[PDB]
Design a protein around this ligand. Sequence first.
Ligand SMILES: [Zn+2]
Ligand SMILES: [Zn+2]
Ligand SMILES: [Zn+2]
Ligand SMILES: [Zn+2]
Ligand SMILES: [Zn+2]
Ligand SMILES: [Zn+2]
Ligand SMILES: [Zn+2]
Lengths: 171, 171, 171
Amino acid sequence: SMVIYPYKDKKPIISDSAYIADFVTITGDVQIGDESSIWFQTVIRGDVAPTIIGNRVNIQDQCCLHQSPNKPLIIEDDVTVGHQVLLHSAIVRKGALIGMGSIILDGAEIGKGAFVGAGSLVPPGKKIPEKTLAFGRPAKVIRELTEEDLQDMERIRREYIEKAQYYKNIA
Amino acid sequence: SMVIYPYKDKKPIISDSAYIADFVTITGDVQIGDESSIWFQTVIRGDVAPTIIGNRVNIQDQCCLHQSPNKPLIIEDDVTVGHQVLLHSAIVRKGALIGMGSIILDGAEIGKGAFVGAGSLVPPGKKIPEKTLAFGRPAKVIRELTEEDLQDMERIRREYIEKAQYYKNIA
Amino acid sequence: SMVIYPYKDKKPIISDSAYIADFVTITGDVQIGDESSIWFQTVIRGDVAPTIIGNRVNIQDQCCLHQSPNKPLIIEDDVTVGHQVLLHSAIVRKGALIGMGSIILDGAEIGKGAFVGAGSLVPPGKKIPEKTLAFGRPAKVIRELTEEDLQDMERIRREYIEKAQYYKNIA
Ligand SMILES: [Zn+2]
Ligand SMILES: [Zn+2]
Ligand SMILES: [Zn+2]
Ligand SMILES: [Zn+2]
Ligand SMILES: [Zn+2]
Ligand SMILES: [Zn+2]
Ligand SMILES: [Zn+2]
């Protein structure tokens, strides 16, 4: 099962259609939208600044979501966050994908439909342009995404919505 | 206190001599062999492609094992997988060691008895030659392993068999 | 909601003023000091060499603390260890900060009040001088810390003590 705690005057607001997996911790000022999914072992501590997660977002296994003072963690609709990602006061725009094993730091902004490659580091305040591939440590813009890249990102988002409904039933 | 779930027509097949630690998640199409050990907080989701783990394998704490479509995750006998490793449709051949904090990506093949150094990234489709030390991001061959290296690899594998037997009793 | 196990003749010695979060695993030869905090999903296995954690230390979420033979894991007073850090037989001196997503390897020594930047790797046996900023893979010394840097390090340490007191009460 999972752990959900208040932090002072703030308690998590989680959509009835969201999936919260086993061994998940969510605390404090966290909002999670419709058909979104928080996968096994993930931690979302909403005790420094607001956390706002949109609709149809998947936050994959063993992620850590946290904030620095006065820097909200904002994850817009249709975002995929890969396994073992660290988001710290990141702004992640609609339909972006954060490659598994990446670290996204304070104030960093990931543009709409951008792809951060696996294992990347996006340093504080850095902006990744919309619909680009960026990877490395620190992440560099590599190229513009193609329709093939975008269709793969759409497939993963849809697959996670379905798998979330399957596991929510099994649990 | 682990969680074991079926996925559609597949349920995990785990040897009676395996150790499954607390807070472990294992789902779907997963086979785990004799005397293998899956350590605290590890996630193995067998919901995209088959996962086959051999005998006397240790998968250390906080690992994440997953697949991409049509790319099986294969971990052969006598493999050591270090703390906090991400394996995504990796092929890890007999007796290899995956250094703690490494990321091994889709269709990457780790040669028999190879040593991937701590903190490495092996990119999709990349092959690490048998019995080499390779490290970095991306991982580069450094040297051929010596008898001293092989004795260290033997010690870790045998120590994890003994620790797994101890904790299985304590749990 | 935590797991605490002995290892042979050693059981963890944890101060009554320490906070041990949910889904934490602590085993064996581990000492944790006064007003220290071990955050969600962290693993501290004290089964290879001694682990000594001082007073007012925060070990953030999803950390893994382990040892190699004959190399104690030493974390002195007033240390901050960031989210998703791996410490393996590290020596971390008083008031140092280990940036989130870093890996500190066997016999590496982090000098008093030093700052290891997020996402860094400190290789085995490497020393980071007192009161410096170091980052990268492997970590390079960049500059001497300023009073502004030290005040940021003090703010984080003090904020964690108080939050630890809050969650310990809620739990
Ligand atoms: Zn944080
Ligand atoms: Zn046997
Ligand atoms: Zn995956
Ligand atoms: Zn063998
Ligand atoms: Zn990690
Ligand atoms: Zn034995
Ligand atoms: Zn270890």
